[PDB]
Design a protein around this ligand. Sequence first.
Ligand SMILES: Nc1ncnc2c1ncn2[C@@H]1O[C@H](COP(=O)(O)OP(=O)(O)OP(=O)(O)O)[C@@H](O)[C@H]1O
Ligand SMILES: Nc1ncnc2c1ncn2[C@@H]1O[C@H](COP(=O)(O)OP(=O)(O)OP(=O)(O)O)[C@@H](O)[C@H]1O
Ligand SMILES: [Cl-]
Ligand SMILES: [Mg+2]
Ligand SMILES: [Mg+2]
Lengths: 313, 265
Amino acid sequence: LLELELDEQQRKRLEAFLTQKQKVGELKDDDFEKISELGAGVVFKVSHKPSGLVMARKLIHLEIKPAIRNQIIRELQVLHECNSPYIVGFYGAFYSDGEISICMEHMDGGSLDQVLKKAGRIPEQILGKVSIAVIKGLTYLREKHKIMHRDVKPSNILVNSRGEIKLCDFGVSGQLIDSMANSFVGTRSYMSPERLQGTHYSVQSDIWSMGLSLVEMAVGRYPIPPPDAKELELMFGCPMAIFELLDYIVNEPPPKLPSAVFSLEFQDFVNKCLIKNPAERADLKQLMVHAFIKRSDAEEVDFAGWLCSTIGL
Amino acid sequence: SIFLQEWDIPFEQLEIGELIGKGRFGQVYHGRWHGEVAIRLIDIERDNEDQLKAFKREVMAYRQTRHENVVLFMGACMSPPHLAIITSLCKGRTLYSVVRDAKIVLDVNKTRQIAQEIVKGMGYLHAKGILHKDLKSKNVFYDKVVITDFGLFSEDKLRIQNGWLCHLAPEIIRQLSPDEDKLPFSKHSDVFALGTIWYELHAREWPFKTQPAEAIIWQMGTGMKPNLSQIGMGKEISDILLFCWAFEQEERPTFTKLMDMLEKL
Ligand SMILES: Nc1ncnc2c1ncn2[C@@H]1O[C@H](COP(=O)(O)OP(=O)(O)OP(=O)(O)O)[C@@H](O)[C@H]1O
Ligand SMILES: Nc1ncnc2c1ncn2[C@@H]1O[C@H](COP(=O)(O)OP(=O)(O)OP(=O)(O)O)[C@@H](O)[C@H]1O
Ligand SMILES: [Cl-]
Ligand SMILES: [Mg+2]
Ligand SMILES: [Mg+2]
């Protein structure tokens, strides 16, 4: 019926999300008016005419028979009770002659993936807030829904102008992932070393992801393979085979934050996430109370401030 | 630049029917080359006017092939814009679908028989010196047993589909992100792919039934062939399974030696 521990101001924001959600009944494809494209891997910044609103919408080709969609939407409905300051609240789900359309909150700031491109490298002071939000987010899921993200990427950490940080693209629909298996791989991985080998992916799997992603955030480059000698030498300011990348992840030592440039506290943080052994790796507790996390939580940061001072808006 | 007249089979009127082709390469329609055939429309990609050996020498060679275990190659035709390949419509069920059909008996001998055919066909294509490359389970039909869709390799950051990944031998599974053809496709590439179909026959599901893409890639990459003995299992079978999957493409059996083993029980 509610939740435990909520910020006074966030309690305001989240409350509005609900009142504005009761305004929308069904989900007519016509009610939505396509506006601008966003991303793909597809999302559009459309607008709902009836509720006179602008919500973010994702949808991907799926020629699944009517028999299937009904169950997918059923599991997908679970998303409703999944409301948190650290989660991109959604609205509903529907078909479209041959595709599923997920409707959710619009984070105008885009995923940290985009932001990391229009900033080159991300300040540690900020990654702290990010780390916190992420940890609380993942914590919220597991505790309140037994659900784990399963897919943690910088491209899935949405951040709006409110200086808010929320997660998205987290696997909640079981039956959907069946048809949603057999898909894009790419050249940058986030599979925890244990997974590549077979071990069940605990919530600690997402931790490795977070850890890995964090590193990419600071150095402004996908950590693996680690920079050469003249590469990293010229980075401070202000071409492989898929199997080889993976094999490296499994046998070679993980990425490390360049010393000197970052606090030793923070280094230890990412280090505690990138422990290649699941059991030996930090749990969502150790991290929540880690020297680094403790600091950044009190560290006064004009997030949204500098935020709109890099990507504008 | 090829026309239907250059083909054995007499053609005058070819009429398309209702689409039935999802697939990667082009769409497949239940058409009528006078008779009842299956038409695949692989609309040509722009430019690339330097692919003679690719078809001026390849596809035309699919003429003069004719086996009881291979789909009939009715013929194709490359226009300036589009491309279309005709082929005998198989009036049966794909091996994929039947090997998973709501409970069908299929013994171990009924299994051996299935494998007998697949290798007879692949052997034929071997002698003709033509690589199948993509020998999936979903590319075998049951009228008897018929192979199909051989030699079909003529899109931004690598899109890996279904169980296709678990048919690629080690040599191949080390693949670039861009790069989809011109991999280490050997004649062993094919014998390997067969192995996985065999596992499929006995396990009624294909290997790594649950692992992600990256997992298969790394696992099959390090040559981590899945279990063999699982109640019920059976020796003999277990053995041949490894041979087909041998990590060194040299250590793998040739279709003609594999057909021999296949007949020993
Ligand atoms: N609700 C949303 N609000 C704002 N931007 C979004 C939203 N959802 C997605 N995006 C944008 O879309 C991009 C990612 O799109 P998409 O989810 O299709 O692929 P991905 O997340 O990179 O890959 P995957 O879907 O496999 O995780 C991100 O850069 C993000 O900025
Ligand atoms: N020669 C054929 N005879 C009968 N049916 C065919 C033939 N070729 C294709 N089909 C039908 O087309 C459908 C899929 O087309 P296609 O062969 O392009 O892909 P596929 O066999 O499913 O393999 P993949 O989808 O992995 O490419 C199958 O359901 C099959 O029944
Ligand atoms: Cl522990
Ligand atoms: Mg996303
Ligand atoms: Mg096919």
